[PDB]
Design goal:
The structure is a homodimer of 305-residue chains.
Chain A: H1 11-14, E1 17-22, E2 25-32, E3 35-39, H2 54-59, E4 66-70, E5 73-75, E6 77-83, E7 86-91, E8 100-103, E9 111-118, E10 121-129, E11 148-151, E12 156-166, E13 172-175, H3 201-213, H4 227-234, H5 244-249, H6 251-257, H7 261-274, H8 293-299
Parallel strand pairs in A: 8-12
Antiparallel strand pairs in A: 1-2, 1-4, 2-3, 3-7, 4-5, 6-7, 9-10, 9-11, 11-12, 12-13
Helix pairs in contact in A: 3-6, 3-7, 4-7
The complex binds ligand RDQ (2 copies) and chloride ion.
One copy of the ligand CNC(=O)CN1C[C@@H](C(=O)Nc2cncc3ccc(NS(C)(=O)=O)cc23)c2cc(Cl)ccc2C1=O binds at residues 41, 140-142, 144-145, 164-166, 187-189 of chain B.
PDB class: viral protein
Keywords: Diamond Light Source, COVID Moonshot, Mpro, fragment screening
Assembly: dimeric
C-alpha cells in the first residue's frame, strides 16, 4: 500500500556523469562507451548566447580546448562533432561503468527520473513529466545544464532528456540525447516563453485508478459519459483532450478495478465541478497528473483493495 | 528555480542490496563489509508470525539454511546472530562496493531517502519523513521487507531505516540498522495500529521559506506572533509544538528571505484559520511537511555527493 512519486534508482546514471569545461563555462556531460554528450552551448560565452553561430564557434576549437573530468581523473578528448544541439566528445577511454542503454525521444505526458548534477557530481534525484507545452517543471540551479532524464524499465537505461535552459516562468527546456529540442525552443538567450500549459488527462485518470486500487472510492458516481461530452467539459478546465488511444491504454486498469474508462471519466468531470470538499485522494488535495498508466501498474498492487 | 521532492542519489546503496531466503520466505538484505543485515522475521513462516520466539526459531537454523544472493552470485554464510529485530549474517566475502557508512537513529520530523527493493533488486527511490507517530507513509508491496532508508553527508552514507511491516491503515513501520523499532511496534502479526499523527511544524515553515525563495509570496503578511501564542494555535490544528531549537534552526532561511520565524508563524496561523482560498503554494493545495530546513537549504544551494 501507499503511493509515492517514485524515481528509478540512479546508480546506473551516476556512473556516467562527468564535468565538461570550455574556457570559462563548466557544465555536465554524459559519458557512455568512449563518447561524452553535453549541451553544445558549453562553447558559448555569455556574449555569444543571443545569436550564437555554433558551427563558427566550433570550427575554432581543437580537441584539447575541451576539459573533461570524471571523478578525479582528466579524460583525453580525441575527437568532436555536433549533432543538432548536442556536442559529442570522443574520448580515449571507454566508461567501464557504461550500463546497457538506449536513446529514446518521449511524448508529452511521459514521465522520467532526473538526476540533477553540478560540476559532474550528482546532487539529487526526482521524478517529473514532459508537460503538454514541452517544458518540464524541474528543480535546477545554474550549473545544472547537461543533467539527464531517464527511465530504467528492467536493467536497460533509456535516456530521454538532457537539460539546456530555464525559461522566465521558472520552468525548464531541453533536448533528447540526439540534440533535438522538445518544444519550439532554441538554445539562444532570445525572448522565449512557455505556451499555456494544460493538465495531462490520461495521467489524472490513471492516478484515480491508483486511488481505487489502494482502497478509495469516495469520488466515484453512478454516471457515465461519451468521449466527446467528456472532452467538451474537460477542455473548459484546461485539460488535454482524451483520445481513443488513451481510452485503450487505460483498459488494463479498467479491467483490474471493474470501473469502465468512461465511468472514470464521469467521476473526473464531477471532481472538476465540485472540488474535493475537504477530502484528499492519495494524500493530495489537487488532481495529480505526473503518473502515467504504466507508472500506476508498475507501482500499485495487482490485487485491488 | 523549481522545488521538487528530491531523494539522495541511490548508487552507493544499490551496490549493497542482496536477496535473503530462508525456507519459503524471501526478502532484502543490506551487505556491508562481511555482514548481511536483514529483518529477523525472515526465519518465520506465516504461522510463526502469530507469536514468534525468535531465539528458539534461530537455534534450529544452520548457516546453509540462509541463501544469500548478490546479483547472480551466491554468497556463503559462515555465521549468524541477532541484534534486537535485525539478523546479521556473517558472509565469507567483504562487499567490494561497501561505501563509507554509519548507522544513525533519526528523530520524528527528519527526512530520508528510501530505496524500495524486491528480490534484492532496487526498483525505486523516494523521499519521506519519519512521522511524529513513528510511521512512514511509504510505498511498499509484499517482498519489500529489508528495503532501507538513508541520508548522505559528503561521501558517507548514514543508514537510518530498515523496512519491516505495513500497518492496517497502509502506513509502514521499521527499525534502525541496530534493529530497534521506530515507534511502539513489534515484529509479529498481531493487532497493531498507528497512533494519531500530527503535522511537522518546523518542516512546514521550512517549505514556506522555500516557496518565498521561489517567488510564491501571497501568504506573507505584516504580522508577527509570540512563540507561546503560536503554539496554542499549533495544538488546536494537530501541529507539533515549535521549540526555540526549531526557531534557531530556521535562522539562516529567516536571514536570507527577510522574514523572521515568528513572522512566518503569523502567515502559518492565518493559513490554518482561513485556508488557501483557492490558491496553491509550490504547486500544492496542502501545507507540505516532508522537507526539513536542511533539505530546503541543500536544494536551494545545489550540494553534491
Ligand atoms: C534563467 N536563465 C537566464 O536568465 C540565462 N540563461 C542561461 C542559460 C540557462 O537557462 N541556465 C540555467 C539552466 N537551468 C537552471 C537555471 C537557473 C537559474 C539560472 N540563472 S542565470 C545564471 O541568471 O541564467 C540559469 C539556469 C541558458 C541556456 C540556453 Cl541553451 C538558453 C538560454 C539560457 C539563458 O537564458
Ligand atoms: C499488511 N500485512 C499483513 O497483513 C501481514 N503482515 C506481513 C508482514 C508485512 O507487513 N509485510 C509487508 C511489508 N510492507 C508492505 C506490505 C504490503 C503488502 C503485504 N501483504 S500481505 C503479505 O498479504 O500481508 C505485506 C507487506 C509483517 C511483518 C511483520 Cl515484522 C509484522 C507483521 C506483518 C504482517 O502483519
Ligand atoms: Cl513516450
Amino acid at each position: 500500500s501507499g503511493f509515492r512519486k517514485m524515481a528509478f534508482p540512479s546508480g546506473k546514471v551516476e556512473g556516467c556523469m562527468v564535468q565538461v569545461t570550455c574556457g570559462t563555462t563548466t557544465l555536465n556531460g554524459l559519458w557512455l562507451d568512449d563518447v561524452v554528450y553535453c549541451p553544445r552551448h558549453v562553447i558559448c560565452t555569455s556574449e555569444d548566447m543571443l545569436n550564437p553561430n555554433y558551427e563558427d564557434l566550433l570550427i575554432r576549437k581543437s580537441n584539447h580546448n575541451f576539459l573533461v573530468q570524471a571523478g578525479n581523473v582528466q579524460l583525453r578528448v580525441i575527437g568532436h562533432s555536433m549533432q543538432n544541439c548536442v556536442l559529442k566528445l570522443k574520448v580515449d577511454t571507454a566508461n567501464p561503468k557504461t550500463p546497457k542503454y538506449k536513446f529514446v525521444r518521449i511524448q508529452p505526458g511521459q514521465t522520467f527520473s532526473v538526476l540533477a548534477c553540478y560540476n559532474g557530481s550528482p546532487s539529487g534525484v526526482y521524478q517529473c513529466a514532459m508537460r503538454p507545452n514541452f517544458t518540464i517543471k524541474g528543480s535546477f540551479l545554474n550549473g545544472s545544464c547537461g543533467s539527464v532524464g531517464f527511465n530504467i524499465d528492467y536493467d536497460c537505461v533509456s535516456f530521454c532528456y538532457m537539460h539546456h535552459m530555464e525559461l522566465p516562468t521558472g520552468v525548464h527546456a531541453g533536448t533528447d540525447l540526439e540534440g533535438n529540442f522538445y518544444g519550439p525552443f532554441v538554445d539562444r538567450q532570445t525572448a522565449q516563453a512557455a505556451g499555456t500549459d494544460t493538465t495531462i488527462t490520461v495521467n489524472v485518470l490513471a492516478w484515480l485508478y491508483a486511488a481505487v486500487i489502494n482502497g478509495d472510492r469516495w469520488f466515484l458516481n453512478r454516471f457515465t459519459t461519451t468521449l466527446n461530452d467528456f472532452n467538451l467539459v474537460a477542455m473548459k478546465y484546461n485539460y488535454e483532450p482524451l483520445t481513443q488511444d488513451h481510452v485503450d491504454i487505460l483498459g488494463p486498469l479498467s479491467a483490474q478495478t471493474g470501473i469502465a474508462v468512461l465511468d472514470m471519466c464521469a467521476s473526473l468531470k464531477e471532481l472538476l465541478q465540485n472540488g474535493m470538499n475537504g477530502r484528499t485522494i492519495l494524500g493530495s488535495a489537487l488532481l495529480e497528473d505526473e503518473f502515467t498508466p504504466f507508472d500506476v501498474v508498475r507501482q500499485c498492487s495487482g490485487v485491488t483493495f
